[PDB]
Design a protein around this ligand. Sequence first.
Ligand SMILES: NC(=O)c1ccc[n+]([C@@H]2O[C@H](COP(=O)([O-])OP(=O)(O)OC[C@H]3O[C@@H](n4cnc5c(N)ncnc54)[C@H](OP(=O)(O)O)[C@@H]3O)[C@@H](O)[C@H]2O)c1
Ligand SMILES: O=C1c2c(O)cc(O)cc2O[C@H](c2ccc(O)c(O)c2)[C@H]1O
Length: 324
Amino acid sequence: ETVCVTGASGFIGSWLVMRLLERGYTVRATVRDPTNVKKVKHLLDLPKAETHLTLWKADLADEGSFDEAIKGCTGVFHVATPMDFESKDPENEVIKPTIEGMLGIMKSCAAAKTVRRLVFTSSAGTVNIQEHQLPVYDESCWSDMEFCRAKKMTAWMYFVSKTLAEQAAWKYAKENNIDFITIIPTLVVGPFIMSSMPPSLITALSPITGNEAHYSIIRQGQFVHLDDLCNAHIYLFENPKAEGRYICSSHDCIILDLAKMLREKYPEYNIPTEFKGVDENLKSVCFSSKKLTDLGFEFKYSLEDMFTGAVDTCRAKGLLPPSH
Ligand SMILES: NC(=O)c1ccc[n+]([C@@H]2O[C@H](COP(=O)([O-])OP(=O)(O)OC[C@H]3O[C@@H](n4cnc5c(N)ncnc54)[C@H](OP(=O)(O)O)[C@@H]3O)[C@@H](O)[C@H]2O)c1
Ligand SMILES: O=C1c2c(O)cc(O)cc2O[C@H](c2ccc(O)c(O)c2)[C@H]1O
């Protein structure tokens, strides 16, 4: 059948298109700039690209820009999003286009008449951004926007855009009887086919790079393998019993435990053994994917799989040095 993937050039977008095409789908991939070779070459290089892949130019900031790509589609994966953590105008450059793009895409599906399910890639940032951390999160849990805006931790504007966009979308979907499903990944880690540094790998490989500003997201961290996640998107689109929100997270551990694993696998890098404000007694925080596994979904990869894939790929593409 015929599906649209928004933001197909990116980390999740491009891997999802690959798996989709492999599964026999016809894919309509959207990008902002089709002339950018670093954004599209990895898509065009996929098997079945000549026969089963089309490219479409679209930006979330433009009203109606996804109408054409979505008309005719049986399904839509809305993966595209503005990823700047360092914007001087968050409201206009990030929050507004994330929310309005989301609702625009839902309207574009409504206009199409052909789309039987819309799947949105939400964010764990919409779940556990509050001052006190519960031991385990599920799909009933939503972030505290007052706390997020006040604290301005790393990625706050991103977390706001994703939370507000999902709540807006559920409002629209309830009021228009739209078959809408959200997937809530934690930190996505693994090998990849894009040519530049995945945004989430900035965070995930911060113990190696020393990007201490990203430690706050992995201090009590949760993880999911790129391929498991992309398989979950396909699974939830296909499973007719699917409803509501779905956490997709396979592992949780504190930064201490992550860095240990990394130190052991990669002696060549300067990975710390101690982190400011972090103790061996710090609670690990779990995102429970029980709702997802209860449907019958199975995770297949380990934390070690994720990080080895990540680092090995980064090296191959000259995004990480061979050693320090
Ligand atoms: N990776 C993770 O750990 C993680 C965790 C939870 C949720 N997510 C969610 O997963 C989705 C994809 O994340 P990702 O890691 O794959 O990030 P990514 O590599 O940055 O992919 C995002 C894509 O969005 C596109 N984009 C940016 N601004 C746009 C705009 N204004 N209009 C249309 N497209 C725009 C970009 O493609 P072009 O430049 O070609 O237009 C980019 O390739 C996002 O919805 C994100 O919130 C990711
Ligand atoms: O969207 C996400 C994301 C991302 O796209 C890029 C990035 O660099 C870091 C990120 O981190 C998010 C996250 C993981 C675990 C949590 O407990 C949490 O609150 C947030 C993740 O969901």
